[PDB]
Design an enzyme around this catalytic site. Structure first.
Site, PDB file in Angstrom:
ATOM      1  CB  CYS A  75     -11.367  64.501  57.164  1.00 29.07           C
ATOM      2  SG  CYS A  75      -9.963  64.011  58.202  1.00 29.07           S
ATOM      3  CG  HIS A 144     -11.911  66.767  63.921  1.00 28.94           C
ATOM      4  ND1 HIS A 144     -11.905  65.532  64.533  1.00 28.94           N
ATOM      5  CD2 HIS A 144     -10.650  67.247  64.035  1.00 28.94           C
ATOM      6  CE1 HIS A 144     -10.694  65.278  64.997  1.00 28.94           C
ATOM      7  NE2 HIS A 144      -9.913  66.303  64.706  1.00 28.94           N
TER       8      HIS A 144
END
Lengths: 304, 96
Positions: A75, A144
């Protein structure tokens, strides 16, 4: 879907990661205050955690680097790349591997770009080099990421886990202000981190120091030549030299601060990726062998 | 000398983060200190490059503290028993 190792969310970690990608004119720094001025930011990375206007044209989403996260634990790399590969030639030089990745994925679908990311050995190696031993042995909730970047007079919100890139950008007067508005709309807290991708501060400070020093040399040379020669006044040359010396002192202090901050980045990276097992084992064994482990252990029993 | 690898070790009931520190390191002879520094992160080992004195933030860390805590927890879980070590060597054989 092979899987990469899990990284910690640290601006120094991301700075060293981008340096390991071969991109040497970029630095990541955390944004504590949103309203504080940031100079020349390439983009922003927004990390969220523990919480509950789409470009849909198939030719438009392919004409820009909007990659889709295929590798699970990639990520941080994905957000950093979504920011960097949407920058142009003028300000920064991407690495050789990053430029090759950019040209290779010119008109590809988001999926294909994510796959190209996942199947680049350089990127995977550099990303997994920054993992802690805990992540390695765990391989056998995290954050995230969402990227914010100006493309062409429009601010784009790229999310690797969403189908379409979110374009909601226009400004007239500077994109930092539009981004501040957009962020103040959706928003200290531990569920949110915000980081800015900026040019290497050390480089700008060193260049400013070079300019200040050469200007100071010019004015000092002319001044000393004048005074040796022995007519006109020399007040203004001396004032110029005084202000130049003050600015040089200020920027030398800036450079020292940035240098110790970079050194702190280096040491935090060297400790974060170290396996302390053998050290702890041999330390305890030597304490026992010396005969002093018993006393110390008797002094530090966990309360029960 | 004393149990260092079994869940029944007294270390499994000991605050290891407070046990292993700068003073406790200073309790060791110099040769022991050198051989021990040879196992530190390269930055701290380089900082210490005849009693050796460690950096004030060499062991007082954020990573070494977590290392000690997780080491005690792994000891409690039984990761360090010779049976688990041989099992991990069989797994390593399977990997290579």
């Amino acid at each position: 879907a092979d899987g990469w190792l899990e990284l910690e969310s640290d601006p120094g970690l991301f700075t060293l990661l981008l340096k390991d990608f071969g991109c040497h004119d970029v630095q990541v720094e955390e944004v504590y205050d949103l309203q504080k001025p940031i100079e020349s930011p390439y983009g922003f990375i927004f990390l969220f955690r523990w919480i509950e206007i789409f470009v849909k044209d198939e030719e438009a989403i392919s004409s820009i680097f909007f990659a889709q996260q295929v590798v699970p634990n990639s990520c941080a790399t994905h957000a950093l790349l979504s920011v960097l590969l949407n920058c142009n030639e003028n300000n920064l030089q991407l690495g050789d591997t990053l430029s090759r990745l950019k040209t290779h994925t010119k008109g590809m679908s988001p999926e294909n770009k994510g796959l190209a990311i996942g199947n680049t050995p350089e990127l995977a190696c550099a990303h997994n080099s920054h993992a802690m031993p805990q992540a390695r042995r765990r391989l056998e909730e995290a954050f995230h990421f969402v990227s914010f970047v100006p493309i062409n007079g429009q601010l784009f919100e790229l999310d690797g886990l969403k189908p379409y890139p979110m374009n909601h950008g226009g400004w007239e007067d500077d994109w930092t202000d539009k981004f501040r508005r957009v962020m103040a709309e959706r928003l200290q807290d531990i569920r949110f981190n915000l980081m800015a991708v900026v040019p290497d501060r050390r480089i700008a400070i060193t260049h400013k120091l070079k300019m200040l020093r050469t200007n100071q040399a010019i004015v000092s040379g002319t001044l000393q030549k004048l005074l040796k020669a022995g007519s006109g006044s020399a007040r203004d040359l001396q004032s110029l030299l005084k202000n130049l010396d003050t600015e040089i002192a200020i920027n030398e202090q800036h450079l020292a601060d940035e240098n110790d901050r970079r050194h702190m980045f280096k040491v935090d990276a060297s400790r974060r990726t170290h396996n302390y097992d053998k050290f702890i084992c041999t330390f305890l064994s030597m304490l026992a062998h010396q005969g002093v482990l018993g006393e110390l252990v008797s002094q530090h029993l966990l309360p029960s | 000398k004393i149990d260092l690898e079994t869940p029944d070790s007294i270390l499994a009931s000991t605050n290891l983060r407070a046990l292993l520190n700068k003073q406790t390191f200073s309790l060791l002879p110099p040769l022991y200190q050198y051989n021990l520094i040879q196992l530190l992160p390269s930055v701290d080992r380089e900082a210490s490059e005849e009693a050796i004195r460690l950096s004030a933030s060499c062991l007082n860390n954020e990573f070494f503290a977590r290392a000690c805590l997780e080491w005690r927890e792994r000891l409690s879980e039984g990761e360090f028993t010779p049976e688990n070590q041989l099992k991990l060597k069989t797994e390593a054989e399977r990997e290579k």
